[PDB]
Write a protein that binds this ligand. Structure first.
Ligand SMILES: CN(C)C(=O)Cc1c(C(=O)O)n(Cc2csc3ccc(F)cc23)c2ccccc12
Ligand SMILES: [Zn+2]
Length: 226
């Protein structure tokens, strides 16, 4: 998160810190959010050979009792996830066990409504991602309020699609989700509407978020089947 604030610790108790293992490189990290006690939603590009989720974190470098380090038993990457277009950059992680609900860990279930969120409002995204291009991932959960932009603000992402994705972050500001924030929720009035997907390497907003409304059926499908 660039240009954000440190979250009040544990104020976003659904936030998941994902450590994503691959065979051929060191861990990568993503965010995500717990939408059921045993499911974390994140970005598909956060898939890996295995993923650990840490719930209850604030400073991810400082173990604390709020932490729940949970094994992911299965990744449900959106079947249409396209590594070229980055369409359908969404993934559900089924945790091996249901997380404990604590003050610091709770789910963020979707409201029934899955209304398409038009441009214009401010939403908040949180993550432990980089706080600038040259900055490592934040030890602490950060969050930033970003403007939902009209889709044309993301035109330059040539595979951006307004129906699939939110365009997030006023380009006039440096505030943005960034690397390491992948998979984090964009909450608009406390409702997850976006998932950090991608943006420019140089961190110039807007960034592209998966538009959750579009994937609600798929999410539901996975949740109901698993
Ligand atoms: C498993 N991971 C994390 C990786 O493989 C590396 C990776 C990252 C990352 O490092 O976060 N992002 C997000 C990202 C890149 S530039 C940018 C700008 C603004 C913004 F919000 C997000 C982003 C990806 C998107 C698609 C494919 C891969 C990645
Ligand atoms: Zn704490």
């Amino acid at each position: 998160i660039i240009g954000g604030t440190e979250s009040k610790p544990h104020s976003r108790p659904y936030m998941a810190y994902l450590e994503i293992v691959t065979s051929n490189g060191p861990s990568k990290f993503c965010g995500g959010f717990l939408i059921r006690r045993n499911f974390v939603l994140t970005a598909a590009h956060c898939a890996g050979r295995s993923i650990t989720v840490t719930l209850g974190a604030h400073n991810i470098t400082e173990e604390e009792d709020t932490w729940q380090k949970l094994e992911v038993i299965k990744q449900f990457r959106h079947p249409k996830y396209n590594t070229s277009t980055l369409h359908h950059d969404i993934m559900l992680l089924k945790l091996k066990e249901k997380a404990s609900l604590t003050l610091a860990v709770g789910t963020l279930p979707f409201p029934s409504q899955k209304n398409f969120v038009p441009p214009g409002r401010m939403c908040r995204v949180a993550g432990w991602g980089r706080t600038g291009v040259l900055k490592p991932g934040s030890d602490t959960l950060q969050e930033v309020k970003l403007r939902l932009m009209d889709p044309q603000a993301c035109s330059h992402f040539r595979d951006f699609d307004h129906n699939l994705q939110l365009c997030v972050g006023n380009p006039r500001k440096t505030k943005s989700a960034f690397k390491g924030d992948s998979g984090g929720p964009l909450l608009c009035a406390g409702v997850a509407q976006g998932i950090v997907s991608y943006g420019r390497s140089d961190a110039k907003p807007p960034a592209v978020f998966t538009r959750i409304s579009h994937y609600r059926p798929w999410i539901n499908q996975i949740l109901q089947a698993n």
